[PDB]
Scaffold this active site. Structure first.
Site, PDB file in Angstrom:
ATOM      1  N   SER A 215       0.794  -1.232   0.000  1.00 38.22           N
ATOM      2  CA  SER A 215       0.000   0.000   0.000  1.00 38.22           C
ATOM      3  C   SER A 215       0.825   1.281   0.000  1.00 38.22           C
ATOM      4  O   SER A 215       0.239   2.362  -0.104  1.00 38.22           O
ATOM      5  CB  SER A 215      -0.926   0.038   1.228  1.00 38.22           C
ATOM      6  OG  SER A 215      -1.792  -1.095   1.300  1.00 38.22           O
TER       7      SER A 215
HETATM    8  B1  LIG Z   1      -1.645  -2.365   1.985  1.00 38.71           B
HETATM    9  O1  LIG Z   1      -0.441  -2.777   1.511  1.00 38.71           O
HETATM   10  O2  LIG Z   1      -1.203  -1.921   3.301  1.00 38.71           O
HETATM   11  C1  LIG Z   1      -2.265  -1.414   4.249  1.00 38.71           C
HETATM   12  C2  LIG Z   1      -1.725  -1.293   5.639  1.00 38.71           C
HETATM   13  C3  LIG Z   1      -0.455  -0.443   5.688  1.00 38.71           C
HETATM   14  O3  LIG Z   1      -0.440   0.690   5.125  1.00 38.71           O
HETATM   15  O4  LIG Z   1       0.597  -0.858   6.273  1.00 38.71           O
HETATM   16  C4  LIG Z   1      -3.510  -2.330   4.318  1.00 38.71           C
HETATM   17  C5  LIG Z   1      -4.045  -2.636   3.003  1.00 38.71           C
HETATM   18  C6  LIG Z   1      -3.019  -3.127   2.047  1.00 38.71           C
HETATM   19  N1  LIG Z   1      -2.591  -4.518   2.449  1.00 38.71           N
HETATM   20  C7  LIG Z   1      -3.483  -5.652   2.323  1.00 38.71           C
HETATM   21  O5  LIG Z   1      -4.556  -5.472   1.863  1.00 38.71           O
HETATM   22  C8  LIG Z   1      -3.040  -7.055   2.726  1.00 38.71           C
HETATM   23  C9  LIG Z   1      -2.679  -7.164   4.212  1.00 38.71           C
HETATM   24  C10 LIG Z   1      -1.577  -7.932   4.763  1.00 38.71           C
HETATM   25  C11 LIG Z   1      -1.588  -7.762   6.343  1.00 38.71           C
HETATM   26  C12 LIG Z   1      -2.676  -6.890   6.725  1.00 38.71           C
HETATM   27  S1  LIG Z   1      -3.411  -6.490   5.413  1.00 38.71           S
END
Ligand SMILES: *[B@@]1([O])O[C]([C]C([O])=O)[C][C][C]1[N]C(=O)[C]C1=[C][C]=[C]S1
Length: 632
Positions: free
Chosen positions: A345
């Site tokens: 993200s």
């Molecule tokens: B993303 O890469 O990162 C977000 C959290 C952050 O900014 O650190 C959450 C949404 C996205 N990641 C995911 O959807 C998959 C996940 C893996 C572990 C928690 S969420």
């Protein structure tokens, strides 16, 4: 330390070239990172029929001029040596056998074996300390004859010894002394992988690099930059060789001497690195790895950080570690631009800029974050809102790290806005190209342009009829990126939209005198690669969401960055990965400080942490680097 390398004939007319010293490498405050250091060697050359008593005579003379390490001496060596170092003990030892030898009833072979079988007791301890000295040299003089030179001493050859032997060579047949230079690293292991190596003279130009060096006019004997900085800046760091021209006649008597080029040492190269920041980053990195391990992250196997000045691309520190299951570290600084990872993200600032510039979304646009449902029952949702329905801004989407806001942005970019239960667009080839083009503009997906070899742009897989992969690209879960790309990207945000070439080279000096930089020859600039195709309101919206991520209570980076000594802004990422079929994440952090006029930017990548329900705060490394850098 000046070896020849060339002797070029023509009109009974010889041209000889003498090597010159290599340029130093300095940090941004002039501190020496890579120097030259002289190494002396004492060598021996074994002739056709040079006897054993002669080698023993030359070696005894040498014990007056050098001191030797008395390792390497095998017990065979001592037993043989003992035979000469008192013949009428050896004769008293083989009274009976010498008579059989003379009768012809045993062979010399049998006799020798039996004599060296015949002592080790109280009468091998007859070897005085000087005997072991002579033998330590004798044993190296016999190593494999013909005019190939064996070395008597390499390590710890003092100048007193080098001088005493050099002036004695006419009395020391077969003996020689050499002067050679090697790179010296005053700061130890720090950044050795980035500095690279030069070839070891016995090497000459390595086979992998041959031809490329020969096409520039070098010789197979020359010592050259083998890797990374030494290779990258090889032709500023190499000297201009001293070249003499001679004109002889008849039998070879020189009638005219010519100095084509007197020779000059290499140019000094000054880096953007601040070696004290580098050492502090390395120390905080190891403390953070150890703290993360004690929190459960015992499979985490890489930890990388880049620190730049976002206004000019200067690389102020660059550090990486590989980590084994017991937490032992291997230096892996080059992984910041040679290795690529799923960053998650943290790319979402780039996704928004791509959405604006294709008019898929407007600055400030609100959308409902909620679980999305697609044909057949496939669902997609945001981690922070797995079961609810929340209206959010683009900058709140960044603060919360919304997935659904970016999914909807991607679907609008694909000309197919979300409706519940829809089937995903069949062909996303053109949308994928537009999304990648937007991400490319901040540094995600192209080479950043770093002045080092082997940079990768990451893994870029096809986007045709895989809409699932396309949506994953919008949240950082398709194409992979290097930590240096993350840093270039956050720097582009930090400096109001200018994507700048990272560079570790900073300037080149017209160096002439020993241990003096000389006047500045040339600056090494971070060139502006491009400005983002976005209005200032679009860039500021991403800046504001980055600031809210670090400074609002609901921001994913609040716990780490809300109390930095200067206000900081940035973006987090957590991506699901797998190792030996076990669920892990990568955790990534980018940021910059101070918000108002940024002078520092960074990226951090950790790989194969546990999947959080317990959120680790690996961004504390970024907090700590910021607090150190803005201490005063
Ligand atoms: B993303 O890469 O990162 C977000 C959290 C952050 O900014 O650190 C959450 C949404 C996205 N990641 C995911 O959807 C998959 C996940 C893996 C572990 C928690 S969420």
């Amino acid at each position: 330390g000046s070896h020849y390398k060339q002797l070029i004939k023509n009109d009974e007319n010889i041209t000889v070239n003498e090597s010159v010293p290599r340029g130093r490498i300095l940090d941004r405050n002039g501190k020496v990172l890579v120097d030259n250091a002289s190494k002396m060697s004492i060598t021996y050359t074994r002739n056709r029929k040079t006897s054993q008593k002669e080698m023993l005579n030359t070696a005894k003379k040498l014990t007056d001029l050098i001191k030797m390490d008395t390792d390497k001496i095998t017990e065979r060596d001592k037993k043989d040596f003992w035979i000469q170092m008192y013949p009428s003990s050896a004769k008293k030892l083989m009274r009976k056998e010498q008579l059989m030898l003379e009768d012809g009833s045993i062979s010399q072979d049998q006799f020798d074996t039996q004599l060296r079988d015949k002592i080790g007791k109280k009468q091998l301890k007859q070897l005085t300390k000087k005997d072991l000295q002579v033998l330590a040299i004798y044993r190296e003089m016999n190593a494999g004859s013909t005019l190939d030179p064996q070395t008597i001493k390499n390590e710890d050859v003092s100048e007193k010894e080098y001088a005493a032997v050099s002036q004695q060579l006419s009395k020391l047949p077969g003996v020689n002394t050499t002067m050679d230079w090697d790179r010296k690293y005053p700061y130890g292991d720090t950044l050795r992988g980035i500095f690279g190596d030069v070839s070891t003279s016995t090497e000459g130009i390595p086979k992998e690099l041959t031809e490329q060096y020969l096409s520039k006019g070098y010789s197979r004997n020359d010592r050259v930059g083998k890797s990374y900085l030494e290779y990258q800046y090889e032709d500023v760091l190499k000297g201009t060789k001293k070249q003499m021209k001679y004109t002889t006649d008849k039998s070879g008597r020189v009638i005219s001497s010519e100095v084509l080029n007197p020779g000059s040492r290499g140019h000094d190269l000054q880096l953007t690195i601040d070696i004290d920041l580098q050492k502090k980053v390395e120390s905080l990195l190891e403390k953070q790895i150890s703290k993360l391990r004690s929190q459960g992250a015992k499979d985490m196997d890489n930890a990388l950080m880049v620190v730049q000045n976002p206004k000019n691309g200067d690389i102020l520190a660059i550090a990486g570690k590989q980590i084994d299951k017991q937490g032992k570290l291997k230096d892996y600084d080059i992984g910041n631009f040679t290795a690529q990872y799923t960053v998650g993200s943290s790319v979402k600032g780039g996704t928004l800029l791509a959405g604006y510039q294709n008019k898929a979304i407007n600055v400030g646009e609100t959308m409902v974050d909620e679980p999305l449902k697609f044909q057949g029952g496939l669902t997609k949702r945001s981690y922070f809102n797995k079961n609810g329905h929340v209206s959010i801004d683009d900058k709140q989407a960044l603060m919360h790290s919304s997935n659904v806001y970016m999914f909807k942005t991607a679907l609008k970019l694909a000309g197919d806005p979300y409706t519940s239960g829809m089937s995903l667009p069949n062909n996303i080839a053109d949308a994928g190209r537009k999304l990648r083009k937007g991400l490319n503009q901040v540094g995600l997906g192209l080479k950043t342009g770093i002045d080092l070899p082997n940079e990768t742009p990451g893994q870029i897989e096809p986007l045709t009829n895989n809409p699932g992969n396309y949506l994953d690209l919008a949240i950082g879960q398709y194409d992979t990126y290097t930590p240096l790309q993350l840093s270039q990207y956050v720097s582009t945000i930090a400096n109001d939209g200018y994507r700048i070439q990272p560079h570790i080279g900073l300037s080149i000096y017209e160096s002439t005198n020993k241990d003096e930089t000389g006047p500045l020859k040339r600056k090494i600039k971070g060139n502006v690669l491009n400005k983002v195709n976005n209005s200032n309101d679009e860039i500021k919206e991403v800046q504001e969401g980055f600031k809210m991520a670090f400074n609002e209570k609901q921001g994913t980076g609040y716990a780490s960055f809300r109390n930095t000594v200067v206000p900081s802004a940035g973006k987090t990422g957590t991506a699901e990965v797998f190792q030996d079929g076990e669920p892990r994440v990568n955790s990534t952090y980018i940021g910059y400080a101070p918000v108002d006029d940024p002078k520092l930017s960074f990226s951090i990548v950790y790989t194969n942490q546990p999947v959080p329900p317990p959120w680790l705060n690996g961004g504390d490394l970024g907090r700590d680097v910021i607090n150190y850098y803005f201490k005063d």
